[PDB]
Amino acid sequence: GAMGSMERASLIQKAKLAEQAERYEDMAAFMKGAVEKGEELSCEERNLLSVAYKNVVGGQRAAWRVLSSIEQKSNEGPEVREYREKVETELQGVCDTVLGLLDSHLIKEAGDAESRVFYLKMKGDYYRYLAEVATGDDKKRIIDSARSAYQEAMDISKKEMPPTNPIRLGLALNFSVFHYEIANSPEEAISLAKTTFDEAMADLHTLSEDSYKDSTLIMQLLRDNLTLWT
Amino acid sequence: GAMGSMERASLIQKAKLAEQAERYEDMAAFMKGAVEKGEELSCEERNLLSVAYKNVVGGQRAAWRVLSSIEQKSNEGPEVREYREKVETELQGVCDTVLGLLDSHLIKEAGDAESRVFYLKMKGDYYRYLAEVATGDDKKRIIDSARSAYQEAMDISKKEMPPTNPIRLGLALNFSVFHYEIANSPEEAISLAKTTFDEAMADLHTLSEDSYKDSTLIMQLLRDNLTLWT
Amino acid sequence: YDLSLPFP
Amino acid sequence: YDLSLPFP
Ligand SMILES: [Cl-]
Ligand SMILES: [Cl-]
Ligand SMILES: [Mg+2]
Ligand SMILES: [Mg+2]
Ligand SMILES: [Mg+2]
Ligand SMILES: [Mg+2]
Ligand SMILES: [Mg+2]
Ligand SMILES: [Mg+2]
């Protein structure tokens, strides 16, 4: 691609500058270029990749919701549908790009739990964003792809990580949200968030001050959803 | 361009949807397409054009300042300079696009004071944004282009508009900022803001409730700068 | 939306 | 910056 001529280290440096500048489309392009160098990503680099695309797709999701809401009010010219479709297609393209990077070849080469769970959670997340805008037949298959990715990530995280591990906690939070918002399974969402919270609570005594802060932050997010849902 | 096949009315409708969705790059592209239909813009349409590009260039200016600050700290690899240059070039391109639209042919066909002052103020604004990132020789010519556009707008607004007219007030505010921030003329900035404020104050008695609200809002902005500067 | 993890 | 008119 267009980043083929830039050094990997220069791409990472520019991704960090783009983050500071809140230039998230640039940041995503830089991190895509870094992934396409073919080497594995460090922990910091994985988080830069995720920050970049989370912000890009987050803007698209917010825009899609505004337009879909106007479109649905409009049905109580073709322009609202056309423009919603344009944004939807762009959103789908970003999700497909992220899923492509994970499939070529980040997940395949990810052997450690911290990297493999991170990437499989991302795969679940971006199928979930596809599911948010999907409708018929495709929606069922997209939902199952999200579920499968989250489930593999869950299986690894329960075998290989402590219950306070922030990657494990964030995965459980998002899988629970998948159950509630996508899969029409609020009871599974609640059960997963509660069991996750309770098992982390019992492990907090093992944690340093800084690890305690990181784990309790995500535990509070789990609690926030449980409060909303119960 | 790419909007050549879309109806003018559809472009305007989509610009409004893009505004609601905070998709300002789309909004700017739609309004550019509308301008390129060749017809004059209504008051509402002029404001859509300006909202769109103000938000696009505003993001670029904020990013450029972050990167320029990091670059200057860095000088107390080439990557910071390269990326700052990339953003700067993109910023310059947006400003050139806006100036191109004003020159082809919005200003030429603008005969009423409300439209001509609006466009000439915009021309001053976007030369001013070019001046913010300009350095040598070019900076002098860009500054003079900004000054000339603002000065013509000022001459028309003092002859044709009341001193409380919000277009006139906003032009005076921005020309005063030009004097302070660009032209190294803080005393002219202060004199212009004070005289503008005082002459509007004396005309407020003529205004309806809604016109009073609009004019006093911009008068407060003038006061805010005077307080900062004195 | 807005229920998921707000960072990576 | 941030001294100019915050709308068109
Ligand atoms: Cl469209
Ligand atoms: Cl660059
Ligand atoms: Mg190399
Ligand atoms: Mg579609
Ligand atoms: Mg029940
Ligand atoms: Mg037509
Ligand atoms: Mg340059
Ligand atoms: Mg003095």
Residue numbers in the entry:
A (entry chain A), B (entry chain A): -4 to 71, 78 to 231
C (entry chain P), D (entry chain P): 136 to 143
Recite the paper's sentences.
The 14-3-3σ protein, which has multiple interacting partners with specific peptidic motifs, was used as a case study. We have observed this phenomenon first-hand with human 14-3-3σ, a protein which has several hundred known interacting partners in the cell. Furthermore, different isoforms of the 14-3-3 protein are function-specific.
To address this problem, we present a combined co-crystallization and peptide-soaking approach to obtain crystals for any 14-3-3σ–peptide complex that may exhibit difficulties when crystallizing under our optimized ‘sigma’ conditions. The second step involves, after these 14-3-3σ–cJun-pS227 crystals are fully grown, displacement of the c-Jun peptide via addition of the desired peptide for the final structure at high concentration to the crystal drop and incubation for a period of time until full occupancy of the peptide is achieved. To demonstrate the experimental reliability of the method, we considered this approach for peptides found in the PDB where co-crystal structures were published with isoforms of 14-3-3 other than the sigma isoform, since they were not able to crystallize under the standard ‘sigma’ conditions or any of the other hundreds of screening conditions tested. The new strategy that we present here has allowed the determination of several new structures of 14-3-3σ which had not previously been possible, illustrating the ease and success of the method. All models were determined to belong to the orthorhombic space group C2221 using Zanuda.
